Structure formats: C-alpha cells, structure tokens
Amino acid sequence: SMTTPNFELYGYFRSSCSGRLRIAFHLKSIPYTRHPVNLLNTVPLLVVSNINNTVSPSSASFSIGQSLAALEYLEEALPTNARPLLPPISNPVARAHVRTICNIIACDVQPVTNLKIQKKVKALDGDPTVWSRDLATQGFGAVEKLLELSAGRFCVGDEITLADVCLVPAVWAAERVGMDLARFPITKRVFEEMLKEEAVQKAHWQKQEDTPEDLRA
Amino acid sequence: TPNFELYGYFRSSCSGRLRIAFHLKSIPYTRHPVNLLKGEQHSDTYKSLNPTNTVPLLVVSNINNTVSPSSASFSIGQSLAALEYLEEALPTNARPLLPPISNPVARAHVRTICNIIACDVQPVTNLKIQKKVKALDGDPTVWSRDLATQGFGAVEKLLELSAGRFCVGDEITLADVCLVPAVWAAERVGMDLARFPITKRVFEEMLKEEAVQKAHWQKQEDTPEDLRA
C-alpha cells in the first residue's frame, strides 16, 4: 500500500472546532497544509486528497466539514499511525465513554455558545456572554461527572484520547466567556496536563500564523 | 435485568434515533417512558440514574464495565455515542449501520450528516433552548424553524453527493437514522420539507420501513391519544 492522503485544513486560530484538529494532527504527527480563513462558509474544513473518494469517484479531493467526523476519519483512514486517539475497538465501553464526553462538548456546549448563536441571542435582546457562560458551565458539570468515572492522568485512563482533544479547545472557548474552570477540578487537572504537551502547544490558539499580535503568546 | 433499557420520550428526536436503531437491528430493549413535558425526569424514581437527568438515557447491563469494574452496567446519555456503541458492541448484528471499515471515506460522509443534525440543529432547537428563547420573549418556533432550515440546507448539499435510495448509497446507515427524527422535529416547527428534495425522498423511503413505523413518534406506548396515528 502506497496510499498517502494529503491533508489541508481551512481553519481559524480562535475556532474551537479548528483547534480540535490542530491538536489531533500534532498528537498523531500528521503533516497538513494550513489555510487560515479569517472569520471577521464552513470552518473548519478538512480537505483530503490523494485518496479513493468512494462517494465522488471522479473527484480528486474529499471534504469533511464536521470536526468530529474529521477526527474519526483520522482514526480510521490511518490504522498504522503510532498514536490511536481512541481505546481499541475490542473495548466498546471505554470508546462509548470517550465519545460521550466529546458529544457533551460538541453537541451540548459548542453549538449553543458559538458566534452564530451569540448573535441570534443578541437579536432577542439577551446577553450572549451570560447565555454562553451558563451553558458552558452546565456542560462542564456533565463532563466533570463523567471524568469522576474515567479520568486517570487524562480524561479516560492514562492515555490521550479524542475526549482530551475536544476538552482543550472548549476550555479556551469557555474561559473567554468568564467560566470558572476551578469549579471543575478533574477537568482543570486534565486541561493542565494536556498543556504540558508539545503537540498542544503547537496547536495553541495564541501560537498560530493567523494569531493577531495583540493575542500572541 | 434487560441488556438494554431506554428511558425515552415519544416525541424526543434523540429518543427516536435510538428507537429506530434498535428496530433496524432487531435488538430487544425495555422501554421506560419519561414524560419530558411533565418534568418526570426530576422525579425520585429516576434519581439514582445519573447523569443529572437526561432523556433519552440508555442503560446497558450484564456487561464487563471496563471503566467502572465494580458495576455490571453503565449508562449513555449522548445518543450519538450510544448509536456507535451498538455498532461496536454487537459486531455480528445482521444489520450494520455504517459502511465497512475498509471504506473510511463513506463512514466519514455518514458521520458528517449525523453531526450536522446532532451538532448544528438538534442542540439549538431542543426543548431546553426553546425554553431559554421563550424566556427572552422570542418565538421559539421561529428560532427553531430558521435553524433547522439552515441545517437541512447543509444536509441536502451532502446528500447531493451521496444519496441513492438512502442517504449514502442504497443501504440504511446512521445518517438515515439521524435524518428521520430530525425531519419529524423540523416539521413540528413548520419547516417546509419540500425545499429539500433529496431529504424528502429519503425520508419517504425510510417511512416505508416497518422498523421506522415501529419507532414512529405517533406509535409509542406514551404517545397521547390525540397525537396517535
């Protein structure tokens, strides 16, 4: 097998969904072409080429506009990669726990606290910051109860999984609306352990090419 | 103890996904209806079933729980995780709902469709967010209709690339299982399904399936008499 997928990521330094993929690519040492897209229509968007597109066979590339599907694609399309981000298939219970945590974040927090929805909330004369902070706080409470069951060094045991990959950019996004991370001690410990990772530092929202100077670290 | 217990509600779209998947795969389960309109998920009987109190809740029993080994059960409060769990925990089931592992591109396409519904539509148009919108003095029905119309436009674009008889090719996948209750939820808020011709056709093809009829929101033990059909 001589199959070598080519990856290009249309992303944004501050997008929490783009940050999942940045983290996942660095942890797995998978080279990608970064195409920054300044949001101030889908971001992120991962374009995979040099593959068999079994959906659109005459097409050179295959697009994935949803970060969770893009993450699972990385797990499935690269079976020889030295770092799986899921427990193995023979452990469906641990995989379900990992996916539960990803879904609380990807389904219960991110979609109700993004720019699009904050704007809809301001259109109803609400306070988008308060709306987002209360929803993030509630979602992190559910994350924390699941981490009480599974966390070791990381969200699920002592290895990094997709759960930690989702957790990190969601902490960045939650802190921006003033959520107090200290309310969720296992989440906080796992977050900090993840920031010790060089791959997480390379994926950092303050450390990308399109990070504005005011925001750089 | 049953292998599977679904605490569901007849008109919950996430519960609908699970009912459809169980019928499609002929997997026996025990149904406990929890009336979300009466706030029954806060009652004492459902106390010890944490999460906090989510509907649907899938309780899985008689298993080796490799996360909490002192227990022979676990519960899953996220329908997407629960759907994937059925695929992996029952690998020899007569109806797999994802294309095989040797076609990761088609599994990615299926997951993308599920994610649009499960991430971009259902969370912003569910009962919790509608109540929040109502408290702002907005119209929750209009809010949800706009958001579902927008999500369906993105689904329809993906179906243009993949759909045959069903969402992805000619076989039922998890994309179809997510689509059906999403169409039910969207129509409930006045979305015009005819604007999305591929979605409409796939939805009508799914409604030909007896399993979908057994999972139908109008055909559950807890469907009120005036909503039955």
Residue numbers in the entry:
A (entry chain B): 0 to 39, 55 to 231
B (entry chain A): 3 to 231
What did the article's authors report about this structure?
The 2.2 Å resolution apo structure contains two pseudosymmetrically related dimers in the asymmetric unit. The apo structure reveals a nonsymmetric homodimer with each protomer comprising two subdomains: a C-terminal helical domain and an N-terminal thioredoxin-like domain that is common to all GSTs. The C. immitis protein exhibits a nonsymmetrical dimer in which one protomer has several more ordered residues than the other; residues 39–52 are dis­ordered in the second protomer. These residues correspond to the cap of the active site and coordinate glutathione in the G-site (see below). All four chains in the asymmetric unit contain a sulfate molecule that binds to the backbone N atom and side-chain hydroxyl of Ser15 as well as the side chain of Gln124 and forms water-mediated interactions with several additional residues. A sulfate ion is observed in approximately the same orientation off Ser15 as in the H-site of the human ζ-class GST crystal structure and is believed to simulate the expected binding of the substrate dichloro­acetic acid. The equivalent Arg190 in the C. immitis structure resides in a different rotomer conformation without forming interactions with the sulfate ion (which is approximately 4.8 Å away in each protomer); it is involved in salt-bridge interactions within the crystal lattice.
